[PDB]
């Protein structure tokens, strides 16, 4: 689906956490509800959602063109520490990534 745009980071590591079947389910869930994941304050509207069989995905939903940006995926307690500087970096990663599209 053209609805989901994977970051290079997301694409590298997705298969560690999700089978194709698990991933398509995740995509169907978001399509049904774009606001599914919880907002991460300080990041300009990035959202974080939990996934079982767990792991976490951070995405941005562009409502204008109905499109999801999948920034990253990781396991709980693996990279789960989030400070103020890390929130800023997610923004920079995002704002840089989303300007051209």
């Amino acid at each position: 689906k053209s609805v989901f745009v994977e970051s290079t980071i997301f694409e590298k590591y997705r298969d560690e956490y999700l089978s194709d079947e698990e991933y398509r389910l995740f995509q169907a869930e978001l399509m049904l509800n774009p606001k599914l994941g919880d907002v991460i304050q300080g990041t300009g509207g990035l959202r974080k959602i939990r996934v079982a069989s767990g792991s976490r995905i951070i995405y941005y939903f562009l409502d204008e063109k109905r499109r999801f940006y999948l920034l990253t995926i990781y396991g709980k307690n693996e990279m789960s520490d989030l400070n103020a500087n890390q929130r800023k970096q997610l923004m920079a990663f995002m704002e840089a990534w989303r300007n051209e599209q």
Epitope: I9, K12, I58, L71, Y74, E78, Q86, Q89
Partner: nanobody, 117 residues
Amino acid sequence: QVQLQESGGGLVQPGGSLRLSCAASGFTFSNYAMRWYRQAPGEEREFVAFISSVGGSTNYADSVKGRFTISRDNGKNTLYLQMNSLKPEDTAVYFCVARLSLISDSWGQGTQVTVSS
């Protein structure tokens, strides 16, 4: 500069063993989970093994479980992959991989493993 430098690759008989090493430099190695990935000619790169920052937790691709062991030395800042009962299908370039944050990482240039009679 963050650097990962793999070594220990070789051309080895099926059934044999190898031990890959990855010498990490330029970052606080012990704070980061480490991974091995591999890539065969013409194929996509694939996950091989994962080890937690302290090294107590590990997990493996189904295809190598029970044959490969991932380990780390947090004083030498070195990551290892012990590979036993090697098969032709294990032939690939093996990569040391550090995820440095949620959105950044570093990959070694890789070491070549070839399993052939």
